[PDB]
Design a protein around this nucleic acid. Structure first.
Ligand code: MN
Ligand code: MN
Ligand code: MN
Ligand code: NA
Ligand code: NA
Length: 320
DNA sequence: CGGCAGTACTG
DNA sequence: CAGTACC
DNA sequence: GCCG
């Protein structure tokens, strides 16, 4: 915000490290970029840079070069491959390893990929919907998608609870996809739904492509009827009722919020996953060596916060 | 030095 | 298994 | 990359 002239430079590096496979450096840049954006003032010195959590020696140095000097030496030394690697890894189902392999084999455009690359089933779908999957939808369309899933699920069993999570539940104006979470208060009737539910959503022509079909998670592609509609990513997760609060929290995110909550859980000798909050977990030197611990009862998202000794945060307040 | 998350599909 | 993906 |  006050330092976008710094963060604009740093995000180019962050992206370059990401698509090249250096996930840890990329994580460090992403965190520092979020810290600099959230800051209350323009950073104007080295020791002020060091003041911020997430900015250490090397990041402060780069912020210092940006100031006064106006640019960053390293940006001029980013491999010419990065834009192509970004292009390739924006195919759903292709990550850094696949993108680098394609690059090594001589492929430089999606036309090369289309005409010469061997593609997995998922990657052919990702390529078929390449532009669509880079578009975010208006949240009103996320609502229509959630209600389509809900109506199809509640026709099989009216007791099923269905909730769109992710960025939708965090109140965002646009959504990259729809994350639909399904449970049943009876603790049992959630099981074996996908056979009927997915077949039902196919009958409409609503489901257009399947990317992942598991016993508890479906990842695929839908499209609402009528003209002017794009293909949209749809994820559906079925969970036992006892896990509903932790799944609500995890799949609402954001990813950084979840990461921050896992770190806090660790400081308290606990662990937090999409399935449960666990206590008296045993670490040896930050590594969970032994001590899986015990699952704590968490009927509500509020209980997770309370058991972590934290004040409750509405989903809109988790958009980190 | 070494964690920075666990969970699940695919092939 | 490695790779990719979910937040 | 950061940080304990
Ligand atoms: Mn989402
Ligand atoms: Mn999703
Ligand atoms: Mn389309
Ligand atoms: Na710092
Ligand atoms: Na991808």
């Amino acid at each position: 915000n006050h330092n976008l002239h710094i963060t604009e430079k740093l995000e180019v590096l962050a992206k370059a490290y990401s698509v090249q496979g250096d996930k840890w450096r990329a994580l460090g840049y992403a965190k520092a970029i979020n810290a600099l954006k959230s800051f209350h003032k323009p950073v104007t010195s080295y020791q002020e840079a060091c003041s911020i959590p997430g900015i250490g020696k090397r990041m402060a140095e780069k912020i210092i070069e940006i100031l006064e000097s106006g640019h960053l030496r390293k940006l001029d030394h980013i491999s010419e491959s990065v834009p192509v690697l970004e292009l390739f890894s924006n195919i759903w189902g292709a990550g850094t390893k696949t993108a680098q392999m394609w690059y090594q084999q001589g492929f430089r455009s999606l036309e090369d990929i289309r005409s010469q690359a061997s593609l997995t089933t998922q990657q052919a779908i990702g390529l078929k919907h390449y532009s669509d999957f880079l578009e975010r939808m208006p949240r009103e369309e996320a609502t229509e998608i959630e209600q389509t899933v809900q109506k199809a699920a509640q026709a099989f069993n009216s007791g099923l609870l269905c909730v769109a999570c992710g960025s939708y539940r965090r109140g965002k104006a646009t959504c990259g996809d729809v994350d639909v979470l399904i449970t049943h208060p009876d603790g049992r009737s959630h099981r074996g739904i996908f056979s009927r539910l997915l077949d039902s959503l196919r009958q409409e022509g609503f489901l257009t492509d399947d990317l992942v079909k598991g016993e508890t998670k479906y990842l695929g592609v839908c499209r609402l009827p009528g003209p002017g509609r794009r293909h949209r990513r749809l994820d559906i997760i079925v969970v036992p009722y006892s896990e509903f609060a932790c799944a609500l929290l995890y799949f609402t995110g954001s990813a950084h919020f979840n990461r921050s909550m896992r770190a806090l859980a660790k400081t308290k000798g606990m662990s937090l996953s999409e399935h449960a909050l666990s206590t008296a977990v045993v670490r040896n030197t930050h590594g969970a060596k032994v001590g899986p611990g015990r699952v704590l009862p968490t009927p509500t998202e509020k209980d997770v916060f309370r058991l972590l000794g934290l004040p409750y945060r509405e989903p809109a307040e988790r958009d980190w």
